[PDB]
Structures are given as structure tokens and as C-alpha cells.
Amino acid sequence: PTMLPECFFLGADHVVKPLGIKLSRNIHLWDPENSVLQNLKDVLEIDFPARAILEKSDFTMDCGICYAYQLDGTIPDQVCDNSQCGQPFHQICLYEWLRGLLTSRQSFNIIFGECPYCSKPITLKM
Amino acid sequence: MQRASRLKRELHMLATEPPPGITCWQDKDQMDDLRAQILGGANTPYEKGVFKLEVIIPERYPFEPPQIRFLTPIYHPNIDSAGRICLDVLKLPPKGAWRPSLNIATVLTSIQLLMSEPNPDDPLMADISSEFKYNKPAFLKNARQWTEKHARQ
Amino acid sequence: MDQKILSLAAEKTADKLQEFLQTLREGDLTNLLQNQAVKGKVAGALLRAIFKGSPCSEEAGTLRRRKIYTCCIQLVESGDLQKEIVSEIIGLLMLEAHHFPGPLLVELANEFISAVREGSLVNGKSLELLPIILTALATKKENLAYLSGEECKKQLINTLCSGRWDQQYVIQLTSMFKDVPLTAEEVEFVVEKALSMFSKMNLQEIPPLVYQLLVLSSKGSRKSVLEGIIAFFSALDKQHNEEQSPSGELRHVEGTIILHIVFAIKLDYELGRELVKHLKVGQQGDSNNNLSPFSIALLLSVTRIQRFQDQVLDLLKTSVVKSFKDLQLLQGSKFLQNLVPHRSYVSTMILEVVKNSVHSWDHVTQGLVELGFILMDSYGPKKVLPSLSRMPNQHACKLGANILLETFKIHEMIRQEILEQVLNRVVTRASSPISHFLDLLSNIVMYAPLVLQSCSSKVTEAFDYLSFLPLQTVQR
Amino acid sequence: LLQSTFSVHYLVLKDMCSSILSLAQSLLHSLDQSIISFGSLLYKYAFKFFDTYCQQEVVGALVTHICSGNEAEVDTALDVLLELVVLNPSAMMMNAVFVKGILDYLDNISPQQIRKLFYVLSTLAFSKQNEASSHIQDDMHLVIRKQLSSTVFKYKLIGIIGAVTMAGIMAADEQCTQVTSLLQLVHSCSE
Numbered sequence: 001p002t003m004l005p006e007c008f009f010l011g012a013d014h015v016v017k018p019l020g021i022k023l024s025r026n027i028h029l030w031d032p033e034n035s036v037l038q039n040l041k042d043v044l045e046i047d048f049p050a051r052a053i054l055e056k057s058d059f060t061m062d063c064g065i066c067y068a069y070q071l072d073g074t075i076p077d078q079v080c081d082n083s084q085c086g087q088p089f090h091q092i093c094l095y096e097w098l099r100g101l102l103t104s105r106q107s108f109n110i111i112f113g114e115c116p117y118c119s120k121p122i123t124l125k126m
Numbered sequence: 127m128q129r130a131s132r133l134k135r136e137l138h139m140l141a142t143e144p145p146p147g148i149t150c151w152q153d154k155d156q157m158d159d160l161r162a163q164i165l166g167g168a169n170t171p172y173e174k175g176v177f178k179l180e181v182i183i184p185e186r187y188p189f190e191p192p193q194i195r196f197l198t199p200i201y202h203p204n205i206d207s208a209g210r211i212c213l214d215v216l217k218l219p220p221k222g223a224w225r226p227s228l229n230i231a232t233v234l235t236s237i238q239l240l241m242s243e244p245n246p247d248d249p250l251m252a253d254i255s256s257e258f259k260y261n262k263p264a265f266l267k268n269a270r271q272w273t274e275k276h277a278r279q
Numbered sequence: 280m281d282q283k284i285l286s287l288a289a290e291k292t293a294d295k296l297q298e299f300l301q302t303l304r305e306g307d308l309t310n311l312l313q314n315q316a317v318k319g320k321v322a323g324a325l326l327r328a329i330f331k332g333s334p335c336s337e338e339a340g341t342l343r344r345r346k347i348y349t350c351c352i353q354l355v356e357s358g359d360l361q362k363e364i365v366s367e368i369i370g371l372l373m374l375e376a377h378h379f380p381g382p383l384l385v386e387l388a389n390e391f392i393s394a395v396r397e398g399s400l401v402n403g404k405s406l407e408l409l410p411i412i413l414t415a416l417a418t419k420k421e422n423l424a425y426l427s428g429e430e431c432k433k434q435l436i437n438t439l440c441s442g443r444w445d446q447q448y449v450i451q452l453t454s455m456f457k458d459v460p461l462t463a464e465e466v467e468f469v470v471e472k473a474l475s476m477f478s479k480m481n482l483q484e485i486p487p488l489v490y491q492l493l494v495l496s497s498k499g500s501r502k503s504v505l506e507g508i509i510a511f512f513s514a515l516d517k518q519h520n521e522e523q524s525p526s527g528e529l530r531h532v533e534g535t536i537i538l539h540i541v542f543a544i545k546l547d548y549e550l551g552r553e554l555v556k557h558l559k560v561g562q563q564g565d566s567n568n569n570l571s572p573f574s575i576a577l578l579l580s581v582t583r584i585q586r587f588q589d590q591v592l593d594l595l596k597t598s599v600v601k602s603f604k605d606l607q608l609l610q611g612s613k614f615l616q617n618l619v620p621h622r623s624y625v626s627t628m629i630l631e632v633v634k635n636s637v638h639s640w641d642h643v644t645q646g647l648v649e650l651g652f653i654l655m656d657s658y659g660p661k662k663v664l665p666s667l668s669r670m671p672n673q674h675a676c677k678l679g680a681n682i683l684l685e686t687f688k689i690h691e692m693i694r695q696e697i698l699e700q701v702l703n704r705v706v707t708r709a710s711s712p713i714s715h716f717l718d719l720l721s722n723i724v725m726y727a728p729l730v731l732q733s734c735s736s737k738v739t740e741a742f743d744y745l746s747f748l749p750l751q752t753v754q755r
Numbered sequence: 756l757l758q759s760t761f762s763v764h765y766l767v768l769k770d771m772c773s774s775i776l777s778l779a780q781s782l783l784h785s786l787d788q789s790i791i792s793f794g795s796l797l798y799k800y801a802f803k804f805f806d807t808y809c810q811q812e813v814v815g816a817l818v819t820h821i822c823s824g825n826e827a828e829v830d831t832a833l834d835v836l837l838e839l840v841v842l843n844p845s846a847m848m849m850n851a852v853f854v855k856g857i858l859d860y861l862d863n864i865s866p867q868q869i870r871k872l873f874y875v876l877s878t879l880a881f882s883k884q885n886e887a888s889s890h891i892q893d894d895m896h897l898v899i900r901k902q903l904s905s906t907v908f909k910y911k912l913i914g915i916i917g918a919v920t921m922a923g924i925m926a927a928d929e930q931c932t933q934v935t936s937l938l939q940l941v942h943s944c945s946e
């Protein structure tokens with residue numbers, strides 16, 4: 001368990017880039033004599049939030065398509081690569097939207113096209 | 127089910143903080159359908175008119191715009207005799223402007239702004255549009271008499 | 280007043296309708312305005328009735344037809360009617376526009392020119408009439424004097440295209456000339472004006488303009504259209520680089536220009552040859568300043584055409600050797616450094632493509648890879664298993680690696696296709712020197728090994744050949 | 756052989772989709788109707804059994820075949836299009852867009868081919884649920900109008916055939932107004 005796990009990030013394309021970079025540069029400082037948290041904190045050079053529940057209780061952290069948290073297991077995961085929107089979505093809902101648009105074109109497991117709220121390029125990898 | 131989560135918040139939002147001059151409830155006659163009432167804007171001939179609209183949510187809402195028609199009749203350039211509304215937000219793009227970013231309340235706010243600022247560029251009633259464009263007083267009289275005849279009690 | 284015209288049209292022609300046409304004379308305008316106010320099908324009925332009642336054998340009717348043409352042309356745009364009656368009006372006018380002499384249609388086209396220059400054409404749906412008029416002038420073998428009707432069409436279109444176009448109605452003008460039987464010079468003038476226009480437009484109004492230009496280009500003018508779109512986008516990139524000394528806008532534009540040039544090259548196996556001929560650097564020995572960050576993007580999207588794959592890749596390869604010969608000669612030599620302005624080198628441009636690649640260029644990356652493994656495979660070392668056989672191979676190869684590392688940072692789906700191909704050239708050969716490839720592989724993995732735990736099986740299935748490999752290979 | 760190949764072992768082959776299609780172009784370009792029927796079957800099972808990207812690549816390939824074209828190829832491609840729309844219109848519907856852009860290259864196609872081509876587009880257009888995408892409907896009315904609006908008998912026929920064929924398709928009360936107006940325009944043009 002103390003050995004490194006299979007690890008990856010959801011979030012904003014502009015937010016997640018540096019985390020991947022920092023993980024790659026620090027992963028050699030992974031050590032199975034510490035704890036999981038005690039290694040992640042000093043690898044990723046950050047602390048965690050302990051349940052930011054009270055402040056952002058009803059901030060609208062939902063799909064912004066169906067407006068739900070918890071769509072049949074699904075969590076808002078896919079976001080906008082934009083400072084002004086940052087709007088989370090679901091896989092299912094954002095596919096069903098983007099599949100329709102005349103703007104959208106599909107590569108192998110990728111769909112390009114416009115964020116519903118701000119109309120900026122957003123990418124979905126199934 | 128995306129329909130369900132959307133209708134849930136919006137119905138609660140439209141019960142507690144609807145746009146001023148706008149009400150919308152789950153209709154008692156048609157409990158799948160919704161009843162909207164848009165109150166006559168001041169500084170327009172539609173003043174002292176509450177117009178009933180029927181709001182049917184299509185099954186693929188929010189990918190599909192709501193279905194909105196005036197049940198209480200209105201004399202308007204961009205609203206026909208049957209209550210049908212010419213507005214881009216009520217159509218799917220590329221022609222229309224619908225997206226799930228918007229809601230029942232934003233489009234009813236757009237309809238409230240349309241009653242205040244009729245579009246002579248997109249007329250359903252071309253007679254009424256020519257009258258609005260060239261003969262403001264005749265249009266204002268007819269629209270105000272129309273308010274008085276059907277939207278009064 | 281309308282029902283009598285229906286009843287005079289019911290039985291017979293040129294007896295009652297002509298005789299009613301010499302009664303009023305004053306106001307067909309008000310008639311058609313109240314007609315569109317009441318019902319459009321009644322207006323269609325009257326239009327059929329008037330146009331049969333005013334034949335073009337007689338000369339009184341032609342001028343009623345002219346005045347109803349000016350009326351319906353202005354009302355179809357300025358008068359906001361319903362869509363169906365608009366289409367029926369324009370279908371009708373389009374239809375009866377054959378039966379004429381030359382000069383009446385010439386003055387109708389002069390009305391169009393004089394409207395479209397200054398007159399804010401409120402919608403622009405009347406321009407659907409425009410081609411049919413020019414069609415009649417192409418076929419009117421009644422000789423004019425000012426000449427043939429087609430020469431009047433030449434004069435009118437030259438006056439139209441040389442004259443100013445409004446920003447919002449260059450799209451409509453171009454999609455319309457899609458149908459006119461144009462020669463070379465004509466279609467050259469259409470696209471000359473349309474290219475002139477790009478700069479005084481929103482960027483988001485370039486893609487569809489380029490689309491209609493190219494489906495039009497199939498008549499005469501391909502070199503011109505492409506040289507134009509290359510020119511314009513190259514200048515944008517230079518502006519953006521000097522201002523950095525709108526990114527995600529410019530890139531999302533260039534990346535849908537390229538799709539549009541690609542569809543056309545599938546539909547036209549010649550568009551490509553003119554492109555290539557325009558862009559081949561190795562014309563004799565000479566580096567061209569046609570080549571650019573967009574100019575190359577395009578080619579690397581072309582590499583996915585089976586027919587061009589080869590020819591394009593081999594160009595780039597040969598251009599890149601050429602790059603390095605030029606730069607080496609300069610750097611060894613101050614005499615040339617005094618004279619020549621430091622031009623960007625193909626190496627640097629490709630790497631800038633590679634930075635720009637990130638967004639939406641799924642179509643470009645599959646060409647990059649083909650390219651880089653061609654650089655390494657061709658110019659890997661051999662004579663030990665000097666400047667000339669070494670450095671522009673070293674720099675070729677070492678371009679290769681830089682590309683494919685840089686790509687492997689950002690295109691997370693062509694991992695296991697770099698990786699698996701590296702290893703594919705690693706394992707079996709062990710006879711050709713592969714030093715460069717393991718050097719690559721070291722940098723690749725080192726950078727993010729966590730990114731090979733997304734493609735891991737491809738290594739562990741290459742460990743099964745470790746028994747058969749020479750010792751330095753294995754240890755290294 | 757090809758039938759049982761792609762019906763049982765799709766799960767192998769799903770990977771190696773790309774290659775199949777760089778094959779399928781090579782089958783149609785030759786003569787020998789049995790070769791060209793084999794190329795058809797590649798395209799058919801390719802859109803039938805793979806994913807959307809492949810499905811999208813299928814239609815795109817068919818588009819190239821029609822448009823760039825010579826007679827055999829064209830004919831084959833249209834036959835396949837008809838099969839694909841009757842099989843899965845819904846999948847085909849989102850690739851309707853390249854199908855519309857065919858109309859920009861009607862210069863190459865013979866009138867028989869034209870009947871099937873407008874047939875395809877209209878059969879796609881008048882799905883009851885994708886009146887939402889009446890886009891193609893309006894654009895096809897446009898090109899009909901322009902062809903009818905011609906001295907040249909060669910264009911007149913195209914418009915005529917397209918128009919009449921559309922009318923038959925929409926004919927399984929506003930629809931009746933369209934068809935009547937349509938056919939009345941044809942009569943006037945033809946008179």
C-alpha cells in the first residue's frame with residue numbers, strides 16, 4: 001500500500017498542467033517508509049482541504065447542464081479551461097450537448113467544441 | 127432525468143425568487159405542464175395586462191428550449207394571433223440561440239424585454255409590425271385596447 | 280381591385296388584363312404593400328396575373344414589370360414580410376427574368392450595384408435574383424450597343440468587384456457567384472476582392488468565407504486562394520509574436536481553415552499539387568519565405584492524405600537538411616552574417632507548431648510523429664557503429680528527439696505510438712546503432728514515468744526479447 | 756467471408772479500423788463489379804460495427820467518392836448511403852453536414868444518380884424529430900430555386916427531379932402548402 005499507487009487528476013487544463021509537472025519532478029522522493037498523505041503532501045508541495053462544506057454549501061458546484069450533483073454515481077468532473085467560467089459539467093450531459101453542435105468535431109476518443117456558458121474551446125476525452 | 131434535476135431547482139427558484147413581473151407554477155389543470163403570468167410593463171401599452179403563457183418542458187430539456195405560447199391573447203408584432211412567439215432562444219442553433227446555460231426564467235425575461243422592445247426585423251404579424259414601425263399611436267392604442275379586452279378580469 | 284385581375288386572368292390573355300393595365304398607372308406599390316399586409320398567396324396570384332397580363336412582345340408592359348421589380352426588390356429586404364412569401368416573390372421574379380432585351384436587365388443590375396454599394400441591403404435575400412439576371416445576359420444573343428449581353432455581364436461584374444463591398448455582404452456576393460458561368464479573369468476578380476476583405480472582418484467570419492471561396496476556386500483560381508490564406512495567416516502569426524515580444528482565437532481559427540483546405544484536397548487531387556508546388560522549398564537549392572508555422576501546420580494535416588503523405592514528408596525532410604546547411608554556413612562565416620537578416624529556421628518553426636499544437640490539432644500530431652521517426656531513421660549515425668555527414672544529421676536526428684519529447688509532454692494519446700515505435704526499433708535491429716533512441720527513451724520516461732503507467736504493457740512485452748540482445752544494449 | 760469476419764471478430768478489428776478504410780478507397784477505384792461490391796461491404800460493416808469516429812470517417816469517405824468521383828464509384832457510394840440511412844439514420848444524421856456540402860459539387864453527377872442523392876438528403880431531412888435540423892431543407896429549397904431558375908434544360912431537369920422526389924418523401928397541413936407551391940413553381944418553369 002505504502003508503495004506508489006496509480007494516480008491521476010481531474011480539473012482545469014490550466015490548473016492540472018503544473019501538478020502533473022511537479023508530480024513527475026518529485027515522484028523519486030516517494031518513499032514507502034512514510035504514510036500515503038505524508039508522501040503526497042511533500043511530493044505535490046501542498047496541503048489538502050478538510051471538507052470545505054460550511055462556506056460553499058450551495059455555490060452551484062453542479063453540471064451546469066442538468067444542474068445536479070450525483071448523476072447516477074457521476075460527479076461534476078469536466079471543467080472549462082477558462083478563468084471566467086470554471087463551470088463544472090458531467091461527461092454524459094456535456095457529450096449529449098456537444099454531439100449535437102455543428103461546431104463540434106470528434107478525434108479518436110476526443111470531442112472539441114464550445115463551453116455552454118462562455119462559448120470557449122472545451123475538450124472532452126471519453 | 128436531466129429534465130427532472132432542471133425542473134426541480136427552477137420550480138423552487140421560480141416559487142421563491144422569480145424575475146419581477148414574472149410568475150411560473152406547476153399548473154393544477156395540467157400538472158405535467160406549467161402556468162406562467164407576465165404582468166404588463168409600465169411605459170408600454172401592455173401595462174395593466176397579466177398574460178397567461180403555457181410552459182411545456184420537452185423530454186430532452188435542457189438540450190431543447192421550453193415550449194411557450196400566450197393562452198390569454200396578445201396583439202404584438204413578434205407574437206401571432208395563436209400566441210406563438212418569434213424569439214431565437216426558443217429555437218435550437220444554428221438558427222436559434224438555445225443552450226442549457228439559460229432557463230425558463232431567462233427566456234421569460236427575454237419575452238418581458240420583447241413586449242417592451244418589439245422587433246420589426248422578425249415580424250409574425252406583418253400588419254401589426256408596419257403599424258408599430260410607422261404608426262406608434264395606432265399600435266399603442268390597439269395593443270392597450272388588446273390588454274383591456276382579454277388580460278382584464 | 281385584385282379579384283377583377285384574377286377573373287381577367289382566368290379566361291384569356293392580352294385582351295382584358297392589358298386593357299385594365301392602361302387604367303390605373305399610379306400605384307402598384309400601395310397594392311403590393313396592402314397585399315403583403317393581408318396575404319402573400321394573393322400577392323403571388325397577382326404577380327402571375329400581372330406578368331402574363333404585361334407580356335414582353337408589347338413595350339408598355341416592360342416598364343410596369345420594371346417598376347414592380349424595383350418595388351418587390353426593395354420590399355423583400357426593407358419590408359419585413361413572412362419567409363414563405365419572400366421565397367415565392369423571389370422565385371417568381373427569378374422565373375420571369377428571362378423574357379427581356381439586354382438593357383432593361385443591365386439597368387436592373389445597375390440598380391443592384393447602386394443598392395449594394397451605399398444602400399444598406401436590409402437582409403440581402405434579393406441577391407438570389409442577381410445570378411439569374413446575369414444568366415439571361417450570358418444567353419441574350421440580342422446584340423447590345425454601349426456589344427453582346429455577356430460583355431455587359433463582364434462590364435457590370437468588373438464595376439461590381441472593383442467597387443467597394445460592405446463588410447457584412449462579401450459572404451452573400453461570393454456564395455452567389457458559385458453559380459454564374461465565370462471564365463478565369465472573372466473568378467480571379469471575385470476572389471481578389473474577397474481576399475482583399477479578410478483584414479476588415481471578425482476572425483470568426485473567415486472560416487465560412489474561405490469554404491465558399493474554395494468550392495468556387497474549382498473553376499479557375501486555386502493557387503491565388505491558397506497563397507492568399509497562407510499570406511494572411513502568416514502575417515497574423517508574425518503580429519502575435521511581435522506583440523508577445525489573441526492566442527486561443529488565432530489557433531482555433533487556423534485549426535478549422537486546415538480541415539476546410541483538407542476536405543477540398545480530397546474532393547480535388549490537384550489543389551494539393553498546386554499547394555505543394557507553391558510550398559516546395561527545394562525548387563533548385565533555395566529556401567522560400569512562403570513557409571511558416573501555418574504553411575507547415577497545413578502540410579502536416581495533408582500527411583494524412585494517402586496520396587500526399589510521402590511527397591510532403593520528403594519535402595519537409597529535404598527542407599530541414601537544407602535549413603541546417605544554410606544555418607551552419609552562416610555561423611561559420613561573418614561575411615554572410617553582416618548581409619543577411621536572421622530568418623527563423625525550419626527547426627524553430629516546427630517546434631513553434633509543436634507549442635501551438637496543444638489545443639485542437641489531433642490532425643497535425645499524427646504527421647509530426649511520421650516526420651520525427653523519418654528524421655531519426657534516415658540520419659541516425661552509421662560510419663562509427665567531420666561536420667557535413669554528422670551535424671545536419673545530428674541536428675536532424677536531434678530535431679527528431681526534441682519534437683517527439685515535446686509532443687509526448689502534451690498529446691497523451693500518441694504515447695504508446697511514439698513509445699511502442701521507439702521500442703520497435705530498439706529491440707530487433709541491434710545491428711544498426713540505436714544510441715539516439717535509448718537517449719530519447721531516457722528523456723521521455725524520466726520526464727514522466729507516471730505517463731508510461733498509462734502504456735506499460737508495451738515495455739513488459741519488450742522485456743521478453745532481453746535474452747536475445749547485445750550487452751551494452753541491455754544494461755543501457 | 757467478410758460478413759462472418761467482421762460480425763464475429765469486430766472486437767479484434769475495432770482497433771485496426773483506420774487500415775480497413777485506407778483499404779476500402781483502393782477497392783472502389785478499380786473496375787470489376789465484384790471488387791467494387793467488396794469495397795462497399797468494407798464501408799458498410801465499417802460504419803455498422805465500429806465507433807462514431809469511424810462512422811464519421813465512413814460518411815466522409817463516401818462524400819469524397821461521390822464528389823471527386825467517376826461513374827462506378829459514384830453509383831456504389833450512393834447505394835451504400837441508402838443502406839446506411841435505412842440501417843441507422845440517427846448516426847448518419849450528425850454526419851448530415853458533409854452530405855449537404857455534396858450540393859456544392861453537383862457539376863459531376865448524372866441525373867439518375869441525382870434522383871437517389873436528393874432522395875438520401877430528403878429522407879435524412881424528414882425524420883420527424885430532426886425538423887430541428889430543417890437547415891438542409893432550406894438550403895435544398897434554395898438550390899432547387901436556382902436550378903429551376905435557368906434557361907439551361909440541363910439544370911432545369913435537376914431542380915425538377917430533386918423537387919418532385921422531395922415532395923414524394925415528405926408525402927408519407929403546412930406540408931401540403933409547401934408541396935402545392937413547389938409543384939405549381941415546377942409547372943410554371945416547365946410551361
Ligand SMILES: [Zn+2]
Binds near residue numbers: 116117120
Ligand atoms: Zn466555460
Ligand SMILES: [Zn+2]
Binds near residue numbers: 068093
Ligand atoms: Zn449532468
